[PDB]
Design a protein around this ligand. Structure first.
Ligand SMILES: [Zn+2]
Ligand SMILES: [Zn+2]
Lengths: 77, 251, 56, 96, 91, 135
RNA sequence: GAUGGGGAAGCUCCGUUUCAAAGGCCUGAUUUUAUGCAGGCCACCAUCGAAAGGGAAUCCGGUUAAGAUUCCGGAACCUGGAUAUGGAUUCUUCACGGUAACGUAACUGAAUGUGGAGACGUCGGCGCGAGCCCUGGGAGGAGUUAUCUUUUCUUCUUAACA
RNA sequence: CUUGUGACGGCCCGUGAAAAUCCACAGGAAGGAAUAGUUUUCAUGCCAGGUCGUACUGAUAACCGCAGCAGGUCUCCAAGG
RNA sequence: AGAACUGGUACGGACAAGGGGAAUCUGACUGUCUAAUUAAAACAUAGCAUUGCGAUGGUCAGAAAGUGAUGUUGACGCAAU
RNA sequence: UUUACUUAUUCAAUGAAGCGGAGCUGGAAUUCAUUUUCCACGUUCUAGCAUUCAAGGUCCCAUUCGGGGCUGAUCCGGGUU
């Protein structure tokens, strides 16, 4: 249950090799009145802790899922 | 009749002294080698109230010369000692406060406290608040020292018998009143179950040798022979005179 | 609490100095000074004793 | 007497009180003399003795207390130590 | 303002216990609650903790002494005569 | 008379190197700009060399006569001086303020003092300095 | 309250570290092997005794006819023991920065010793915090409404742990 | 309001438990490198965590008072006017 | 805190919530007791006074005992009145 | 009646540590011949620290990684005091 910001850290985490499960949450959010944005939350699950890579850019989000491995069992929600 | 109060205090179920809040005994270090061939240094590290006593104590620290450790002792504090203090104890020590010079070494007119009665009892005489022992004279050939005890008593004791220099602390204590059964309550409840004292002449004759009668009166005289027994020794025991004394202790 | 002291690492338990997590730093100062001073005093006492009793 | 000479120095010469400024002056060598109160810590006392040994400055021990020395210099607080840098008028440096 | 003519600290004891005992207690309560001077630092930070425990807050020291005063006169005499005979013996 | 002269022996009381014996080589008695107070550059020991006997044959001997020295800027108030002295030729050049603020310069300064300390200790000299202050 | 010991016709009494030969470790040497065995250390001196004293470690949500911090889901913590990768240190072998207070991801340390926490009264008022209570706006729902009431009530939450 | 704590203050002829457990420090035995090792008080990863209790009442009806007795029986939470 | 205006002079509007004074006897006080007929003037209390005791001891206990309470104590103390 | 001996008995300590004697090494002693005996026979401005069969010196060993004995710390008697 630890925040994460470094993306390559998150990637080597996905390949920590105890990691098996992952999740991607979408959230409807507000920066300002007229641009209620879309917060992405990559929650990866291994053994001792859950790591939450936070993101507030859909372009980066898509790129991330394009970068991820296929075998890591994901949950989109 | 019936068993009576002192005659139960011997058995001592509820009359045992209370001990939870005491630091153990206060005693003089063993007369091992140094205190009978030289001296040793110790550090008064702290001073502390002991509960049930009236004087304070001194947590003092020496070093066992035979082993790498620090052996702690509990002394009685005389007036003039303080923390972080160097207390030199033994035969070849110095005549200041706190030191433990032998009575054979000290001179006449000297003041001491926590004095031994025979070398290796480690503190018998004048251990209570403000009580001191005075030296009188020696007979070094057949080494003996005459000392005057707070009862005025001229005793003779050995010369290797140690004794701390100074006057015991906490003096003046009984110069103050108490004013309050509660103050006395607290006193005797940390000492031992010894209070309140109730009068036999108010008891019944089963419960005491004064009790009873349509008038609170003793009836039979309270001056009791020393060769009386356990059950009769209520009153003034082995007494030589009674009443108000007017004059002098005469000693 | 003590078992939690046993959990944590050294950084959280003491200080990088001699007498890290035992004695106040000012007390460290004081006792260092005491050591140096009185051993020097011991030395000068020793040599004055030696020379006066050598004369005598 | 000594308190009179010290007041003369307070008026004419110059000085600094207290351990910190005193030992700073002594490190700089600018001082000449120290007066030290009896009551102040034996450690501080011996340390100053060492410092003045190095500096070759003079030392004097005051038959009094931080209060007495303060009254002597004319101040109203505790002074365990005083450093005479120069007197000008007094025989302090000459006597004792 | 000025509160009490002559009871002082013994007005908390009220109308009890007799004037004489209140006088004695007054004397000794003053003695025991007063601040004294630590000989080591000259400061007025000396107080009783307990009977014959007289401690100084400023200089973090403790001295043993009388329950109500910090130096009892008997022990003063003892200090003096000890110094006397000790000077004589070393002499 | 000032005595904070650049060959001196002193006793560090405050800091990671406290209770230590350093040698004074470069006193900035009249202040500075970056450490503006009565301060110095000094050097001393971080790990004293151990006692040595006849029993040791050469390996424990080398291991025990090793040194871990250090250098340090410090306040005189955070120093204690002595009367002892020491020779300062081998490193009074390399040591400077510019030797600091560059860890490459630091390590090089540490290399030479070790050599400069080991031989003066390997010679039975300055025993008081190469000893330990116990407390 | 055993044992050792002493009493007692004796059932049993005293006494709890004492007039006791009161034991069990670390190290390596045997790598036929036991643990004999080279070595040194140390010195409780049984035990029992508090479901309110001390004490290693868990929380939320939901769930049953009846259970729940115990079950389910999720997220955590300690203890013990194997333990491998990464990282730090080092050819100046057991880290560096800081004037200092001290800081950091770590960053050798046996015997023995020292210190600290555990571990500590009661009362007063003062400050600070938590939850509650009072309350404004706005978003939903309900009520009243002959009259008047931008109205009365109600939901707007966020645990351990990091 | 209830509570928890922090620093202070007052009182005492009263100064207001112990032990287990844990940690650090001093010390420097022992051992350790260069193609190497070093450490498992840094991160991460692996396994296991037994035994017994656990429902309910806790009282003008579940307890004791011969009983579904106006009695007695330790405590926590505690809204608005 | 104060002022206008008002009221069938009512208004701490219910609840809540001191009767007092002058003297006597007696115990000083607070406190405790005869559970289930006596709460008092009784006991206690602080304070006053006396007595014993220097540890090979005083007081008390125990069938005894290498036993024990005061005593982890020491005449400003323990014990008995 | 006075005192003597320690072993019996009794008391108390202590982790049964420094007993006693003699002796060095110094001071005094007047030595009336050589010492006659007596004193010491490692510590005191300071709230530090003191430990690894002790370092050293010395003699051996099988030198090598090191190992051991004497002294450092006088000797005798084994009466714990
Ligand atoms: Zn401190
Ligand atoms: Zn003071």
């Amino acid at each position: 249950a630890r925040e994460i910001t470094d993306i390559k850290q998150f990637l080597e985490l996905t390949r920590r090799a105890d990691v098996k499960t992952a999740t991607v949450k979408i959230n409807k959010k507000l920066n300002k009145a007229g641009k209620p944005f879309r917060q992405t939350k990559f929650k990866v699950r291994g053994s001792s802790s859950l790591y939450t890579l936070v993101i507030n850019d859909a372009g980066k989000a898509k790129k991330l899922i394009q970068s991820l491995p296929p075998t890591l069992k994901v949950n989109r929600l | 009749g019936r068993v009576i109060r002192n005659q139960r205090k011997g058995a001592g179920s509820i009359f045992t002294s209370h001990t939870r809040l005491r630091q153990g005994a206060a005693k003089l270090r063993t007369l091992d080698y140094a205190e009978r061939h030289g001296y040793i240094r110790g550090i008064v590290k702290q001073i502390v109230h002991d509960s049930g006593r009236g004087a304070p104590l001194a947590k003092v620290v020496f070093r066992d010369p035979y082993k790498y450790r620090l052996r702690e002792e509990i002394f009685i504090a005389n007036e003039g000692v303080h923390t972080g203090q160097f207390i030199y104890a033994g035969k070849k020590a110095s005549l200041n406060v706190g030191n433990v010079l032998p009575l054979g070494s000290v001179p006449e007119g000297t003041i001491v406290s926590n004095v031994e009665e025979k070398p290796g009892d480690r503190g018998a005489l004048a251990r209570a608040s403000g009580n001191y022992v005075i030296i009188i004279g020696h007979n070094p050939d057949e080494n003996k020292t005459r000392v005057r005890l707070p009862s005025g008593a001229k005793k003779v004791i050995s010369s290797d018998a140690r004794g701390v220099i100074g006057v015991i602390a906490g003096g003046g204590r009984v110069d103050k009143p108490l004013l309050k059964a509660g103050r006395a309550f607290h006193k005797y409840r940390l000492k031992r179950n010894s209070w309140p004292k109730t009068r036999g002449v108010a008891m019944n004759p089963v419960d005491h040798p004064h009790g009873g009668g349509n008038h609170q009166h003793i009836g039979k005289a309270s001056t009791i022979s020393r060769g009386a027994v356990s059950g009769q020794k209520a009153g003034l025991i082995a007494a030589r005179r009674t009443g108000l004394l007017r004059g002098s202790q005469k000693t | 609490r003590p078992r939690q002291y046993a959990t944590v690492s050294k950084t959280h338990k003491t200080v990088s100095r001699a007498y890290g997590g035992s004695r106040c730093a000012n007390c460290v100062k004081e006792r260092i000074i005491r050591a140096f001073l009185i051993e020097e005093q011991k030395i000068v006492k020793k040599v004055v004793k030696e020379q006066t009793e050598a004369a005598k | 007497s000594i308190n009179q000479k010290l007041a003369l120095v307070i008026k004419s010469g110059k000085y600094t009180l207290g351990y910190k400024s005193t030992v700073k002056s002594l490190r700089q060598g600018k001082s000449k003399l120290i007066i030290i109160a009896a009551n102040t810590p034996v450690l501080r006392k011996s340390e100053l003795e060492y410092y003045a040994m190095l500096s070759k400055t003079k030392v004097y021990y005051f038959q009094g207390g931080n209060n007495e020395l303060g009254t002597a210099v004319g101040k109203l607080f505790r002074v365990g130590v005083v450093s005479i840098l120069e007197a000008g008028d007094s025989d302090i440096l000459t006597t004792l | 303002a000025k509160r009490t003519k002559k009871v002082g600290i013994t007005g908390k004891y009220g109308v009890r216990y007799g004037s004489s005992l209140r006088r004695q207690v007054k004397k000794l309560e003053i003695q025991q609650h007063a601040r004294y001077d630590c000989s080591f630092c000259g400061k007025k930070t000396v107080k009783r903790g307990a009977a014959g425990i007289w401690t100084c807050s400023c200089c973090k020291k403790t001295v043993a002494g009388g329950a109500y005063t910090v130096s009892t006169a008997a022990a003063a005499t003892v200090r003096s005569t000890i110094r006397r005979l000790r000077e004589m013996v070393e002499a | 008379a000032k005595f904070l002269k650049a060959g001196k022996v002193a006793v560090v009381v405050r800091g990671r190197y406290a209770g230590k014996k350093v040698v004074i080589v470069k006193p900035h008695d009249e202040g500075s700009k970056s450490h503006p107070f009565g301060h110095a550059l000094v050097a001393g020991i971080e790990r004293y060399p151990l006692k040595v006997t006849k029993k040791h044959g050469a390996k424990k001997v080398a291991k025990r006569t090793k040194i871990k020295p250090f250098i340090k800027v410090v306040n005189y108030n955070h120093l204690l001086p002595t009367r002892y002295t020491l020779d300062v030729e081998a490193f009074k050049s390399v040591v400077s303020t510019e030797t600091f603020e560059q860890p490459s310069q630091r390590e090089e300064a540490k290399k030479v003092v070790k050599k400069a300390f080991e031989e003066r200790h390997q010679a039975g000299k300055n025993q008081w300095f190469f000893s330990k202050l116990r407390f």
